[PDB]
Amino acid sequence: MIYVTFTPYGAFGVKDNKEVSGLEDIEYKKLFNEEEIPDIMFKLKTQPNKIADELKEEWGDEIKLETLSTEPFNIGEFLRNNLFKVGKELGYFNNYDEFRKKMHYWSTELTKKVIKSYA
Ligand code: NA
């Protein structure tokens, strides 16, 4: 059973909700290229079960998404508290100003898609 959290820049999984200190403790990593980030934020938001079946195929195990759980996962707490630092380590953000500007753009693009979804 793989427990998965998504950030804007990736999907990250660990078997059996194990504790996570660092990226070395993360067993499954799918990184997203920046041009698809908002599209994938919107698909997570509107068809999470489809996202889950896709990961089940790609990673080879049943999948629990954190967005479909009432209790946060160890992996989710780690990524939320280290969202900038892990994204810098992965090459998405060179500094905090960039992180801020990128997160803003992605969120704005996601909103645009959500507004459109409402006719
Ligand atoms: Na560890």
Swiss-Prot record:
Residues passing through the membrane, by range: none
Superkingdom: Archaea
The family this protein is said to belong to: Belongs to the NOP5/NOP56 family.
Protein name: Uncharacterized NOP5 family protein MJ0694
